[PDB]
Design a protein around this ligand. Structure first.
Ligand code: ADP
Ligand code: MG
Ligand code: ZN
Lengths: 300, 664
């Protein structure tokens, strides 16, 4: 669940990739199913939306049993897991996943060639906010990171809702394709990490499920201040928590090789300077020929 | 076998062996039989479709965290006649048993629902017999009644003691908790242990509280005989029923007719006369729903899950907007430009609040300026019928503070207080003002703030407050001289001023012209409609089927389904704009301003660009779509440009139409 200990239980179930994937919370049916689940668990809606600290202690203590008996009905049996929780005297307790989420949020939104250099300088600066958050004396930074993580997850959820409602995810035999052109929050997706977050959200939702053959996904975004794309190849994922011989085997990311070969053969002034070779920057005009060549290559 | 656990059968249950219905029901075995039969009815009842109605109702009840299960009286009467008779004759104990059997059907679906709501109430929807406050007599005492009236007065919600605990003054022993009647006070005279004449201090370690409210129900003006004083009754609203009825509304009250001893009554009258009250069981909002009395259920605008699926299926159709427009006032022959505007106003736009500093209206106002006999009042009546919350007012029949809000002195507290008006009553609804041009200037001017700011400001008698008026206004007016003069500009044909005209999003000018083909077609349609509506031209199922067959001729969508669709779209759909042609809209606005520079023309301001956006939002909403498409924006642009062109004069109309042909 997303930041269970620093938000409400309703928010924790709502803004979770796995819960949305297994319930489709991006439409009204998913919300109705979630409300029905909460009603059968015996937790009032007002109680669920209460913050974690002030939630009724009886329900908080019984939460483990309540989940043990009710999550199986709705297919959320995988929510049960064992993690590491760290506490300091007279302070709140924070789990490892929540700490990592706060650090990533600080890294992402913490606060021609010239603009690119300025953006990369800003990211380098955010690195130091993330570094400072690792200290026990700087807890205000951690709280700020938690709030930014909540906001970023909300924005990514809105963008994913927009993508899925419009049916923007074109399906080609070799691979899937999704291109963002006129979203409300296009600026947030200049950072590769936010784009990867959105890509993971989309991969878990409606793709990990539906019993559809695994297919690599292409996610692209556009920034008007520079008029270029940020293409990011994403490897497919097996259903979460499904131990199997084929699930035991890993899935490799072949997009770096195909992108490099296309760039070398073609002439579109593509950038492969990023460490993650699957993320490239493409000029506005060249994306259509690049995708044509990608489809015709068949090396994905 | 324990005799207290044995049960009878239904035919044996019909045969009564007690001195009264209450005594028969209260017997252990009879109570067990009644509970078993009620549970069977709840679990096994099936409609024409074949699915359990009450299973779905219980599922929805649990989903929404509610504590009221609605049961239709007709269903119970058909399924179990004897139980319906018992409920009619002895509502109290029957309702207690029904409430118990309902928390065991709810708990069947949601095992741990007791942690949300301790108890669940059963509400009767359609009692076959309807009484007036004048018709009530002593024979209706301690029996379920259904009355209609006007909520003249209201109290604040108070916590009432569910259980009262008593302790002896002298002995100090604490008597057990006792049930608190809603009607009158509970007292202990004779102590079981102490046997002390003296009173008991009322004390309790822990007490459970209940919501309580009281209203003054008055005969509605429509039903009271002309020129006669109205009769009134006091209605008591218990938990979950409070705040459902607001003062000035018209409601139908299903409750228990109860009497109690009143000393002052006796004193004043001089006879042993008992005061009377009504214990509300269910409330149905009858305001603005006179023509909707033929339906069933407490709320006719509510929907079920299957109806929601049907709404989705209807919306997925490509030509949904055309069908919706065609279904607006099917009995009116043409005026496809007055139907489109009415549909857009009914669906409305999406209000916006930019960063919490800027507020933008999200409602559409329409004005009908036309000839005397062009079916405007009928359109207003249809809009009143279809809208969820509607208020109808006439020109001179409306005062400047009858609209908006007014200040009075409270009879009880002798203090200045605030009352609502037409606008207030039409919150998130529609306000219809027939004979707009005949309004007093003062009266007219009142609505200026309300129509754009969506708020009412009152500074009177030390009362400094701002209300919410999020109501759309559709008005019908007659041009100066009683007939439109197409040669003169629009401004010279009406006496309204620039601000009021600008506040109206859509203008629909109606002209009556003599034409052989148009006259023939209109006369044929009118005659066909008149023949169709002639009163002479299961039994309930047969009546519904023939009504549906009659309706199918003139409307592609059922009217009740249309009202439910409109309510669902308004409540659950909030479209947004993300992809749109900025240059197209900007050029359209600039061209409109340039053409409107002419003297006496229809005023044009940024309000109309915002109205174009609002109409695009409404068109998107008509399809239950979460995003505005280019087609909806084009349709809104066409509507606005067509209205502007039609508002012009004859001489320049051809030039204007030729110039604007690109957008339309
Ligand atoms: N286009 C039309 N289609 C069907 N009936 C019409 C049409 N126009 C007028 N009528 C009939 O003529 C009458 C017009 O009266 P009404 O519209 O109430 O007057 P006003 O237009 O001043 O409000 C109505 O009873 C209506 O049945
Ligand atoms: Mg009229
Ligand atoms: Zn005593």
């Amino acid at each position: 669940l997303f930041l269970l200990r620093h938000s409400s239980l309703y928010d924790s179930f709502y803004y979770s990739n796995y819960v949305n994937a297994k319930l489709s919370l991006w439409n009204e049916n998913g919300k109705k199913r979630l409300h029905k689940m909460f009603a059968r668990m015996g937790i009032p809606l007002s109680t669920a939306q209460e913050t974690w600290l002030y939630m009724d202690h009886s329900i908080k203590r019984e939460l483990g049993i309540i989940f043990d008996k009710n999550l199986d009905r709705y297919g959320l049996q995988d929510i049960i897991r064992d993690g590491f929780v760290r506490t300091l005297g007279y302070r709140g307790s924070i789990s490892a996943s929540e700490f990592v989420e706060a650090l990533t949020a600080l890294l992402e939104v913490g606060n021609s060639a010239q603009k690119l250099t300025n953006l990369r300088k800003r990211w380098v600066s955010n690195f130091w906010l993330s570094w400072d958050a690792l200290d026990d004396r700087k807890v205000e930074l951690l709280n700020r990171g938690i709030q930014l993580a909540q906001d970023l997850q909300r924005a990514i959820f809105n963008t994913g809702v927009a993508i899925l409602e419009k049916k923007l995810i074109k399906h080609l035999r070799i691979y899937r394709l999704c291109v963002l052109q006129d979203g409300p929050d296009l600026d947030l997706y200049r950072n590769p990490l936010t784009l990867l977050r959105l890509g993971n959200w989309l991969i878990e939702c409606c793709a990990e499920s539906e019993d559809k053959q695994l297919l690599p996904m292409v996610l692209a975004s556009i920034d008007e201040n520079t008029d270029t794309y940020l293409v990011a190849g994403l490897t497919p994922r097996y259903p979460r928590g499904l131990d199997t011989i084929h699930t035991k085997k890993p899935i490799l990311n072949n997009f770096s090789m195909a992108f490099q070969q296309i760039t070398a053969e073609t002439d579109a002034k593509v950038r492969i300077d990023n460490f993650e070779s699957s993320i490239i920057e493409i000029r506005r005009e060249d994306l259509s020929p690049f995708l044509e060549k990608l489809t015709l290559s068949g090396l994905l | 076998i324990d005799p207290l656990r044995e049960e009878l059968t239904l035919e044996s249950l019909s045969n009564v062996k007690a001195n009264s219905y209450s005594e028969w029901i209260t017997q252990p075995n009879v109570s067990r039989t009644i509970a078993r039969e009620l549970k069977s009815f709840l679990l096994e009842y099936t409609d024409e479709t074949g699915r359990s109605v009450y299973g779905a109702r219980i599922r929805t009840l649990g989903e929404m965290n509610s504590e009221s299960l609605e049961v239709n009286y007709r269903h119970l009467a058909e399924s179990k006649a004897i139980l319906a008779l018992f409920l009619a004759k002895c509502p109290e104990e029957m309702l207690k048993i029904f409430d118990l059997v309902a928390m065991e059907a709810t708990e069947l679906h949601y095992p741990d629902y007791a942690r949300i709501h301790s108890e669940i109430h059963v509400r009767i929807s359609d009692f076959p017999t309807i009484y007036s406050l004048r018709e009530l007599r002593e024979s209706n005492l301690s029996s379920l009644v259904r009355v209609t009236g006007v909520v003249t007065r209201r109290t604040g919600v108070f916590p009432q003691l569910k259980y009262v605990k008593f302790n002896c003054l002298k002995c100090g022993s604490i008597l057990g908790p006792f049930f608190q009647d809603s009607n009158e006070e509970i007292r202990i005279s004779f102590c079981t242990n102490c046997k002390s004449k003296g009173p008991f201090r009322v004390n309790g370690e822990k007490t459970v509280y209940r919501n309580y409210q009281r209203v003054t129900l008055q005969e509605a003006p429509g039903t009271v005989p002309p020129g006669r004083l109205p009769r009134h009754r006091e209605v008591i609203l218990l938990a979950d029923l409070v705040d459902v009825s607001k003062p000035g509304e018209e409601v139908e009250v299903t409750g228990i007719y109860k009497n109690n001893y009143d000393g002052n009554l006796n004193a004043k009258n001089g006879f042993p006369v008992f005061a009377t009250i009504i214990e509300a069981n269910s409330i149905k909002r009858r305001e603005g729903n006179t023509a909707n009395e033929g339906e069933e259920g407490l709320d006719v605008f509510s929907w079920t899950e299957e109806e929601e699926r049907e709404f989705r299926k209807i919306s997925r159709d490509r030509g949904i907007i055309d069908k919706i427009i065609s279904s607006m006032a099917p009995s009116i022959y043409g005026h496809r430009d007055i139907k489109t505007a009415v549909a857009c106003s009914l669906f409305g736009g999406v209000p916006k609040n930019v960063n919490g500093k800027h507020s933008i209206r999200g409602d559409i106002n329409v004005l009908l300026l036309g000839d005397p006999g062009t079916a405007k009042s009928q359109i207003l009546k249809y809009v009143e019928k279809t809208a969820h919350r509607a208020v109808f007012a006439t020109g001179q029949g409306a005062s400047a503070v009858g609209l908006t809000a007014s200040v009075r002195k409270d009879p009880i507290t002798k203090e200045w207080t605030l009352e609502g008006g037409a606008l207030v009553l039409a919150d998130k609804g529609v306000c219809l003002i027939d004979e707009f041009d005949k309004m007093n200037d003062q009266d007219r001017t009142s609505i200026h703030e309300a129509m754009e700011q969506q708020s009412i400001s009152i500074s009177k008698a030390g009362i400094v407050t701002t209300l919410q008026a999020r109501c759309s206004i559709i008005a019908a007016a007659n041009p100066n001289g009683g007939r439109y003069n197409s040669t003169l500009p629009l401004a010279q044909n009406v006496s309204l001023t620039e601000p009021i005209l600008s506040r109206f999003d859509i203008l629909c000018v109606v002209r009556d012209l003599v034409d052989e083909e148009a006259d023939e077609r209109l006369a044929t349609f009118v005659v066909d409609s008149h023949v169709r509506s002639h009163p002479e031209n299961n039994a309930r199922q047969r009546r519904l089927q023939r009504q549906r067959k009659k309706e199918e001729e003139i409307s592609p969508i059922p009217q009740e389904l249309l009202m439910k669709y409109i309510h669902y779209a308004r409540t659950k759909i909030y479209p947004k704009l993300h992809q749109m042609d900025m240059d197209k809209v900007s050029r359209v606005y600039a061209d409109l301003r340039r053409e409107s520079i002419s003297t006496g023309s229809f005023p044009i301001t940024v309000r109309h660009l915002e109205s174009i956006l609002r109409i695009a939002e409404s068109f998107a909403k008509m399809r239950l779509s979460e995003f505005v498409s280019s087609y909806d924006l084009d349709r809104a642009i066409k509507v606005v440009v067509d209205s502007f062109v039609d508002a012009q004069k004859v001489s320049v109309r051809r030039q204007l139409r030729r110039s604007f042909a690109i957008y339309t």
